[PDB]
């Protein structure tokens, strides 16, 4: 019933140490909460700060201001549209460059 969310990164998945990255979760309109999960599934961030790109879509952003190698790893989206959590996005592997 609920379409899988999709995940993308801005500017990309390979980030100079100390600089920033933003993940985008995209999902259907009427999403309540977007959750960006890491591989350890106690680490995750929620947001209700939803925006729309198209009438039948909604989305939210997660900015990491200063990346370290402990940020490196898998990242996934899942969203909540009452009464149901969707299923999980594909993973996006974030990597940290030295320079």
């Amino acid at each position: 019933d609920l379409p899988r969310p999709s995940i993308s990164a801005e500017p990309g998945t390979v980030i100079p140490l100390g600089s920033h990255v933003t993940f985008v979760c995209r999902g259907p309109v009427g999403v309540q909460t977007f959750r960006l999960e890491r591989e350890s599934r106690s680490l995750y961030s929620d947001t209700e700060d939803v925006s729309q790109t198209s009438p039948s879509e909604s989305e939210a952003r997660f900015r990491i201001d200063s990346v370290s190698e402990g940020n490196a790893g898998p990242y996934r989206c899942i969203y909540y549209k009452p009464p149901k959590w969707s299923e999980q996005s594909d993973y996006l592997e974030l990597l940290v460059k030295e320079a």
């Binding site: 599934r41 106690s42 995750y44 990491i64 009464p83 959590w85």
Partner: protein, 162 residues
């Protein structure tokens, strides 16, 4: 001197009436102290043993409960709620000791189930932990206040017979 004796005997009666008052106020003081320290020691013991937590608000439990009362369910839960959101998120690598609570409390998102709100889950936990702590604190205050009152009213009574 019959009236001499009745004077000391009315003096001993006032002493004994005062002693009773003394022995209850001394008992209650000691019960308060024993209580607001079994509480602290019970809540710390519970966080450390059942939940593997040894700090809050980025201080050790010892120091934390010196500045926020172990009964303050609202601010304990708010502290946990906040520390969970700003140390188990995306935007730091700081201190991930506490994050296990989300697994324990059942917050991890399960595709196919309803949403468990973080803060409600924490306040259910903290209410349970604080109720437990207040009850053991009350037992400590009950024992210690009784043991001190008994000893005081005894000691004073025998003093009032010399």
């Amino acid at each position: 001197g019959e009236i001499a004796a009745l004077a000391v005997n009315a003096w001993k009666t006032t002493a004994l009436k005062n002693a009773i008052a003394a022995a209850q106020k001394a008992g209650d003081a000691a019960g308060k102290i024993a209580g607001e320290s079994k509480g602290v020691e019970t809540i710390i013991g519970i966080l450390e043993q059942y939940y593997s937590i040894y700090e809050l608000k980025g201080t050790p439990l010892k120091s934390f409960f010196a500045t926020t009362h172990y009964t303050d369910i609202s601010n304990i839960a708010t502290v946990i709620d906040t520390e969970l959101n700003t140390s188990c998120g995306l935007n730091s690598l700081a201190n991930q000791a506490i994050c296990g609570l989300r697994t324990k409390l059942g917050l991890v998102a399960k595709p196919g189930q309803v949403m468990v709100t973080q803060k409600e889950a924490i306040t259910k936990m903290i209410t349970n932990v604080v109720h437990k702590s207040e009850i053991t604190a009350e037992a400590a205050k009950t024992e210690v206040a009784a043991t001190k009152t008994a000893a005081a009213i005894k000691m004073n009574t025998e003093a009032i017979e010399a």
